[PDB]
Design a protein around this ligand. Sequence first.
Ligand code: A1AON
Lengths: 1034, 150, 100, 50, 50
Amino acid sequence: MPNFFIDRPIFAWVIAIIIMLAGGLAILKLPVAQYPTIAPPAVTISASYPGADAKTVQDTVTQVIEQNMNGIDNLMYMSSNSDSTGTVQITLTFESGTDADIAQVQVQNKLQLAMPLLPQEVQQQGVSVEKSSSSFLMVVGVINTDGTMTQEDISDYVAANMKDAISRTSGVGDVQLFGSQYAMRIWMNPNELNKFQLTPVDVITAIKAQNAQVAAGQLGGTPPVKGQQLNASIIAQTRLTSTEEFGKILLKVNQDGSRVLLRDVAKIELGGENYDIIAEFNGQPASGLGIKLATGANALDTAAAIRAELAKMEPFFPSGLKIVYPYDTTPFVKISIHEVVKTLVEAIILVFLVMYLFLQNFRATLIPTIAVPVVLLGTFAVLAAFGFSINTLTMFGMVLAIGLLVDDAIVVVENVERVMAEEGLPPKEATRKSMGQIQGALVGIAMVLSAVFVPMAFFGGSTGAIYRQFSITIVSAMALSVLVALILTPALCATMLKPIAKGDHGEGKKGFFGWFNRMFEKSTHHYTDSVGGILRSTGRYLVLYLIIVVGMAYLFVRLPSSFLPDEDQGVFMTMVQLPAGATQERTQKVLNEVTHYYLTKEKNNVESVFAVNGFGFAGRGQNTGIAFVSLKDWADRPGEENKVEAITMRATRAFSQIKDAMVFAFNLPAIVELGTATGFDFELIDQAGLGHEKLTQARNQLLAEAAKHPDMLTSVRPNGLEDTPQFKIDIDQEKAQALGVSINDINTTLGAAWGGSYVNDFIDRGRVKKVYVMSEAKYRMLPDDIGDWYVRAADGQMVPFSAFSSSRWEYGSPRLERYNGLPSMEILGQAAPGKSTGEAMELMEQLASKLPTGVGYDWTGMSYQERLSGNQAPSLYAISLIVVFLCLAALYESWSIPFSVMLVVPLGVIGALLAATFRGLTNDVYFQVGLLTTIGLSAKNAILIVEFAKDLMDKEGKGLIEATLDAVRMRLRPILMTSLAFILGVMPLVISTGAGSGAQNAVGTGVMGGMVTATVLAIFFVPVFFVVVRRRFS
Amino acid sequence: DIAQVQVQNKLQLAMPLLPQEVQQQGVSVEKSSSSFLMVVGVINTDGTMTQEDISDYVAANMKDAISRTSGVGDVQLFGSQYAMRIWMNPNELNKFQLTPVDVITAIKAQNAQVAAGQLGGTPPVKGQQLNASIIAQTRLTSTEEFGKIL
Amino acid sequence: GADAKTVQDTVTQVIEQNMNGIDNLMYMSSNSDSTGTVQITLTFESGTDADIAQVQVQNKLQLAMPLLPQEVQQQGVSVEKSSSSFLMVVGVINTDGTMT
Amino acid sequence: DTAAAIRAELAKMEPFFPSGLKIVYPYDTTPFVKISIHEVVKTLVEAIIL
Amino acid sequence: LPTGVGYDWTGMSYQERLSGNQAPSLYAISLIVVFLCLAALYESWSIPFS
Ligand SMILES: O[C@H](COc1ccc(Cl)c(Cl)c1)CN1CCC(Nc2nccc(C(F)(F)F)n2)CC1
């Protein structure tokens, strides 16, 4: 096949042009995102039941929905939580590879069938089903500096003016508003209501009656009278549109005729739908917009379009309003992608430089410069054909495969040049001979590398997807590299190279090139002499190989395991947790302290703090909060102390002094969608209907038992809230009946006053908005205020709550959790240093096995994936080894020679492990993929050496030792000039300390160490293996 | 999947027109075979439980989990889950001048769980230090509680 | 029994807000009538799977579904694949003349 | 696969059953499927031997 | 027309505009493909040009 294209250079050029055009089209059309879809598809059902506690929401909402979640396909599991804020959130996690749209529609349809079973208030608020597996591309904050506007005003302006245009922007998959529109608010005064002998029920009824839309017909509508000439539509009562109209709503008229309008007993004002969450941006009122990218959309282009649309908005904004970007990771993504592209380009340049240094022929150096970009473009085209996208994993896969591509080009070009220099043949016949020598080896190497890299794609779950990214990328790059080396590279060698003499090795050259040449023949002679001396004492080097293997096992077992390096993305989060029962003001004070610290002590690094009072992770209440701290540009933060890790450690140390609050600063997970992968997630399930208290006791016992094992488990804590005091009101039905007051009226008055009620809608500036009736804050603060509220009995006399009710304080859960439809409690933990997560989970299972009767357990989150993919690696790599052995036996036509090639893996693995250990890195995904790349390249070198030696023994009459020595002499130069090029290409990643330095270092350090040791050891261990194997079996 | 999606898309138009009792009993749309894949029976080898108890246990502790298993298209319970059964005596109702309407109204009023709001709820007053959930009438959980309805 | 402007603001805009995130969408049209009817048509690119497009439109619509007035829910919001032309018209007459 | 998943779920449930409760399988066509497939495979092996 | 009043095409007109817009690209790509195929088959850059 190489001979076909050697005689047809134009056909090979046409093939290369086609590949380049396809790659360019793919680059133009390929989506770009930081990461692909890694986490399993998940669908979240969210409902709100205003004024309701956790138990009320769970009993009336959560349990019904969970009982009606049946018949949905590919559901891995289902969890739910009901808060004291009145919010239920149910996450259904489906198996990987499930169509998210189909799962989402099935979940919606089962909820639509369950909807009639829910409270009317829950139905009125609406139950929303979303896909929660995705994260936010961007978060655009809107702030007011003049102080004229508040959070509600800014949120309403964003909803009315900004949301639509952002949604219409190209590539904007989803837009969610951090806040709510305006809503009419009826702040009831209990004393005024008692004075006029009214109750909140009357206000609700009047508002419903006097704010509605009525269908009214048409003048002349059909069936029509015989000569009708005019047809028109009749307009009747329409919804109110202003606070003034609501003010005049009439609730009663006095005997005298003075009118008891609505404003008499309440304050009418436009406010927020919910006041639970307060937002500030550097201590200024703010609202937000979270923007999620669409499918197949370019993240960079989408961010640019969003910014352009916001700039278009800017001139029309009300004076004093400003756009800010509290959370913008797109710059980090851009820098990472640009750094990878720069790495690839510099790799090509280093290949050119090394090729010129060794061969000292410009036309020879041109050939790899044409070959490698063609393979890269073909790889892009193949990725587009498979539906992949340009992301961090794919780009680093290309970076890793660059070494294989460089080796493929260098082998062909150097072999052709060596044949020309030795036999003196002209370029065409020299190329023919070289390809006749190396083509079978190249095909066998293609098969071997396919066997090595394909199995990654068959891991299960999130790790399966992460490894499949690299697997597809590298396998496609390798296949295109081999195809190019068989099609185009020989044609380029035959057409571009110029004749070289039968004996010229360059030693006649005058300056640095001549010195380097002569030094190189001297070094090659010394290397051949050393190898020959080695082959006479093979036993010592066999025991040395055993020592190397033992050291490899030691380093592997003693190396920690990780998932993905933590990156300095320019943003981190501080979570604030106040004691139970804390109010919004105390959390606001703590958040103000945190913001002041960040903007004063860390003023050089931090540019903005987005404080969110009322919402924090693993909670939703007044006693929780979260601040999203954004750092200045990496170029403005030079040093190791000005990075996210150091900043977070300093902030945590400073905040540990804060009293009456737990404040903890931390960096983002590498993949926020998967969240943390640090430890284990454990679910303790109530299986026998024990109750909340018994489950709490079981959880406490398990936590104590885990704490009694410091050396195996660390920071085993509950991922939930503890029980808190609650105000219980016991309404005596007998007393209420005796005094002539209905229980329904009492409950309605209490709920409307102290929790608020949603009555109906109105039209504000041509937008439908909600109407809420609630007590004024002054009269719904303390238990004593219960005495300020009166209910009208059937007799028309107002009776107090104390007359027909009593009060006390009890304990209740502010957040109730369920797993797979049963009550549960979530425990988060992690293995102690030096302990694997598997044995930590085994110990947790052993501890849980001793818990009281009726208490079960389950694994969720990352633990579920770990259980799924626990045993895949050994079997997959056993299959890989078997297939590699079979391919090598096919290549060499021998059942024993393949062992000489396969004995080379430890040579690179040991160096990779040593490099990782010395730099204090972990066994993460990047390290493993780099390990596979190093193993593949070392196997390539060994395969070529053994092929040359065997061909020398068979086609010629040379003996074992002579053939091996000649083979190593022939293969020394390509090995060295590939290792040097790849090592120098990866050095920038090794020494990188800027943005994205985590993944860069993880990819670079292991690769560099593995290449160094693979080269150095293999160049004189492979001949030993070949000689020993040939002697043993022959 | 698409067939079920379209069928229930059309069914959602009829749902508002169906009687409230039908909606409250739960309308189901399913895609499954006409024949049972299998039958998982449950007995008691000690003889302590009756048919009602076994059926309630299967409905409450095993039915939902099986229904959520992938590949399960339908689950038919050979029994029924427990429920609070009020067996009315017409003679007693007439003696006290009562009607099943009155019984239903009393059950609805005195067996309910109401959202009662919060102490120190947002918007709060300045200087508010306490925030708590107000608990009120809760659903009854025993036959004794139901028998005490006035 | 709703005006064209009122139904457009209360219904048409609300629905149209959440329909901009659907895949393979070429363009969108909508008409609001004084009879209270709202008709929105989303035209997708050629070769798009119609069933998947309809499923995605349902998924986006259910988000805005609660925001519509209770009367809209009572009558119901329908999402279905549509065509703008009649394949044929089948008329029925009474030759005798005994049926109006 | 569905039968295997159902049996796995029942195994999860079983440890928490009340005293005396027992699961039985009064109707299951799956064992016939397994035995039939096994018999055909056995026939193939015996055919190779013959 | 006054400022703020734009226009667009729909239905048949959208398809007609798209076809007219993408015709020249189609011609160029087809010519390039034929040229490359001729060069590949006849092993020359002169025969495809002629
Ligand atoms: O995951 C979502 C977004 O969380 C964030 C938020 C900010 C950043 Cl910068 C980032 Cl990165 C992430 C969670 N989210 C929390 C509250 C929000 N509801 C709200 N309501 C009123 C005001 C606000 C606030 F504070 F965001 F303006 N939010 C709705 C759901």
